[PDB]
Amino acid sequence: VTNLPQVIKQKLTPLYELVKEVPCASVKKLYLKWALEEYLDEFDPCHC
Amino acid sequence: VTLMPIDCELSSWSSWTTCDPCQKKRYRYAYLLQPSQFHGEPCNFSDKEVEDCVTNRPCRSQVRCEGFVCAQTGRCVNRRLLCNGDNDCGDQSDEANCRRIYKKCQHEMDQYWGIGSLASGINLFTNSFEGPVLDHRYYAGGCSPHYILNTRFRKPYNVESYTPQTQGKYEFILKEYESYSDFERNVTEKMASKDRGKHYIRRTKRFSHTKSVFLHARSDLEVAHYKLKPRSLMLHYEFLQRVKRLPLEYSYGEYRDLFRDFGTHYITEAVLGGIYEYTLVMNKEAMERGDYTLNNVHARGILNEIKDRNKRDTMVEDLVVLVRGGASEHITTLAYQELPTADLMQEWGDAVQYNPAIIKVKVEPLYELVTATDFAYSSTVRQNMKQALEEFQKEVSSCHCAPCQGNGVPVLKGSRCDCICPVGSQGLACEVSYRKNTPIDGKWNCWSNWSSCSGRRKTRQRQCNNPPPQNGGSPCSGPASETLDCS
Amino acid sequence: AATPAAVTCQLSNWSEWTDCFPCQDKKYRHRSLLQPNKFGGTICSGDIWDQASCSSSTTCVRQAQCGQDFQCKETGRCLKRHLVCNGDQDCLDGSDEDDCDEDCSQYEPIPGSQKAALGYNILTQEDAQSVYDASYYGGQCETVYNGEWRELRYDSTCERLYYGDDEKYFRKPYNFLKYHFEALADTGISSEFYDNANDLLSKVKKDFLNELNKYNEKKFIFTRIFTKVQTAHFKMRKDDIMLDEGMLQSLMELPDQYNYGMYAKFINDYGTHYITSGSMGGIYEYILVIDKAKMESLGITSGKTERARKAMAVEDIISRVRGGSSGWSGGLAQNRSTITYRSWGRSLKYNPVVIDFEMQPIHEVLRHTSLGPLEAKRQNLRRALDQYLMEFNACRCGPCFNNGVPILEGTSCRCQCRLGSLGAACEQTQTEGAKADGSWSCWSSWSVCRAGIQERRRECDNPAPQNGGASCPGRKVQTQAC
């Protein structure tokens, strides 16, 4: 395992925080947020 | 065997399409209407007929190769790839007349194992790689150093990540059930006088025993993960050349051959693995009856005596092993009937690193490859290909195939349906077995194509297929009826 | 057992000669394979097909037959222009490298490159002459990774036990669309046992006496073991085929008019079928089946006494290895063990077999070639095959005892019996209670026809099956377009 690992424990940042050096990145950051919020709104187990 | 074989039928032909402006040919096709089965005769005829044309409609087929035309293959390559010391054209054309060559890769670098195998599209319905769609020998500059263990590798331009993602599961179960019964019942009666006498006897036994042993052990080993890029893809030239040969007119047969040659969908994300499934299944039974009786009279005298004794013992046992990655020396010893000693298992998994199968995969429809930077009139070729892809799924989906005996599974390769037979039954339809009965798993007939627009419906039945005959398993895997908006 | 049906071989009277075709320089004629021998009787001195030298009625056609690009004058192949002086040998004359930089020959041809290019004979299960060109590359440098390459070496000079760089890559022939190198195996095992006994008595006495006893004991074992291993699988191309040069010339040498002989000869030389796709493997099957029984009975009365016993044991055992080394396939033939499987598997690295494949009838090859449509010839080739699969068919090889395989060796049938000498009465150790199937009698010729009716006919076998034996897949009539 010292020669072939995997990720075991994780601390997270929301994906939208990465958007950088693309056209309209400023807006795309918020839109990827609202899209993630809406993704979570589809995906949240509360529907089940 | 209870058979009369089904010979192939294709339909009567379509009308011709009008002549294509760019391919300068016209096409006619037939649907596969009934597959070859029970060794009934094939009628395949390579599923198509085509003819030349004399029409003069304008054509815009000259989508510009901006870089350099690969003289044999008809690929284009960007000008920084000429004289990179690598074959970007397929036929080494790009490296002709190099006033100098510049190398990039500082060391030898293996292809990741199976990376050229992942390069081919799948027929999603046979679940098979068909043929080559993306050029996994193309390196776009590349030469970035990647490592697995201490081995070093080159990543094909088409691939986002190949990484070990090195995960393993083992799941084991053992089960035993046993049950025993024994019953003994007797009678005795007597009389005497001074002359006469009488006697009677019965003794009995009934007995039973049962056992099962069931064992299942599965391991899934997942020591690479592949993801293909979403788009900006570089195509394998043999695919690219059938795509440049598709009509802009619609006539399903020429589009059908692309799915036959290059698959229905391209593999976009896959986990790459070895599997070692082992199952051992045993049912055992025993029974006995013993019975013994006498009768006597005395006055002169008479005796009667009887014995009846019986035994049965049986085992039915099945074992299956499937292994799907590794090297042939390990693979055969794992494939041996005995539960593998952990040394074998070690050397097998070590070789899975060098020859994986696909474990689980997410696929995209092949028309997302068809692109305006690669083909003229691309969007018409896409719309055509989307329609043909739907019609092709209706042909390749197994549902046409008459049901196998012995719970056999159809996969419908080419234009023949062949029933894969489980352990314990044999022959063309999987009829021939020593066993009394087998549970059957359900699948539908082919679904009704659509109802009218303004709300549209599809419907399915299981009339022969159904589980209840000889007490089968699950009937279902999806919705027994289906409906949608027209737009 | 039934008496033998041995007869001396007959060919037909000759047909009249074909005329002296230009470039071919030959007359041909044929005999119709009228009746090759049953399992006994002396062979035909003659043969089906004839060639004789003759001068032609007109001058031979020039290499303009290939059109706008080069053709190697002393052989068949019409070539795309880029192949001339590509640095690789594209035709049997080699003139495509005469009077002038591919390095791709660095990699050896893919394992199975030969047997997948060879044609095939559904009447005899044999290979045939090359149909595809097993070594044609079309200028392609198409390399394939060897998923089995891993093999150990040791180095005394530096203390490494490690896996060798040899065999890592193969050159794919242009005629293979893909050849995939994924490792798989699948094994399926059954065991079933049944074991029974019964024991019974009765007695009466009066003052006469009578006593009776019965015994039975029985055992059965069945097992089947199947394994398949695969090192790679492949599919041949279905458009722009490059034929074998031998196939190509042997095709151009065919008449535009329908005469059976030359098309029958190309069928016989290039095979009834061509392999469209296959899998490269080692298969081991093992099958082991046993029966035993023992019985007794006693009777006493007053007096006199009598007793009898009868018992049986029979074992069928098969071990068969396809693929592997000659040495280790002897090991795994002789013994099933954790020994014999592992080294057999190591030998499948080096010597695989095509284990399973799919195919098309030979005439379909032409439409998929670069030659352009040959429809008149293609229909003559089909029309001949539609007689050939009646005429050359192992169906005519007649009764085989003890489930023996009927096969036509060229002009003469064999019945390969699994025990004893071949032909009639293959058994003298087994009793007349032995079990053997009914299997097909041949197709008829195409029968006399009407606007909506034509027939061809079969029989499931001539006799019934031997004792409890199995039967054919079940047909009597098939129909045709008249």
Ligand SMILES: *[C@@H]1O[C@H](CO)[C@@H](O)[C@H](O)[C@H]1NC(C)=O
């Ligand atoms: C192979 O030999 C081994 C060791 O002597 C023996 O245990 C085994 O039964 C043999 N198997 C076969 C198939 O003969």
Ligand SMILES: *[C@@H]1O[C@H](CO)[C@@H](O)[C@H](O)[C@@H]1O
């Ligand atoms: C297309 O298909 C029908 C069905 O056999 C034939 O009569 C003919 O080939 C038609 O053109």
Ligand SMILES: *[C@@H]1O[C@H](CO)[C@@H](O)[C@H](O)[C@@H]1O
């Ligand atoms: C018919 O229609 C659907 C398409 O959504 C098929 O997937 C299915 O076979 C159904 O019966």
Ligand SMILES: *[C@@H]1O[C@H](CO)[C@@H](O)[C@H](O)[C@@H]1O
């Ligand atoms: C071929 O066969 C005839 C009989 O048909 C003989 O007269 C002669 O052998 C000819 O060559």
Ligand SMILES: *[C@@H]1O[C@H](CO)[C@@H](O)[C@H](O)[C@@H]1O
């Ligand atoms: C009987 O069987 C062969 C094998 O299919 C056919 O090709 C032919 O019709 C023959 O008479």
Ligand SMILES: *[C@@H]1O[C@H](CO)[C@@H](O)[C@H](O)[C@@H]1O
């Ligand atoms: C009869 O012999 C076998 C058993 O069906 C087949 O391979 C073939 O169909 C032939 O007619």
Ligand SMILES: [Ca+2]
């Ligand atoms: Ca280059």
Ligand SMILES: [Ca+2]
């Ligand atoms: Ca050359």
